[PDB]
Design a protein around this nucleic acid. Structure first.
Lengths: 62, 62
DNA sequence: CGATAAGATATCTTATCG
DNA sequence: CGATAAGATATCTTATCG
């Protein structure tokens, strides 16, 4: 079950992954609008606490 | 400083990485003793990934 | 069936530019 | 100081062989 990736929030926010990922990791070096955009994005997409693979993994393409 | 990796468990179990890696994710087509050693290995070595961002800060210095 | 190797994707880290 | 781009590493999944 992989609903959202930090990439998803990033895209939805309109910012690089580590734009928002940096935000999610502390965001000690960013701007106002950015945090609010990522915050909005993750909020809308719900964004579960599993960007990488803490207690749930799996990935495929093509 | 870097804790266990699936490679560590793999080596310690005496099985290729891809063997135990698939084990930890399903282990559909795997023998008995194999599961025992992978499980043992990860158990003995404790096995803590930390491939995200918990306490493992310094990783690669480029 | 069980084990090994290769390919693809995501996350994080570091460096550069405005 | 802040955002973007490139590179490296690890994990996961699928296919083939004995």
């Amino acid at each position: 079950m992989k609903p959202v990736t930090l990439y998803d929030v990033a895209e939805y926010a309109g910012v690089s992954y580590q734009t928002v990922s940096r935000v999610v990791n502390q965001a000690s070096h960013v701007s106002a609008k950015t945090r609010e955009k990522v915050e909005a994005a993750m909020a809308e997409l719900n964004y579960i606490p599993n960007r990488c693979a803490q207690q749930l993994a799996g990935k495929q393409s093509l």
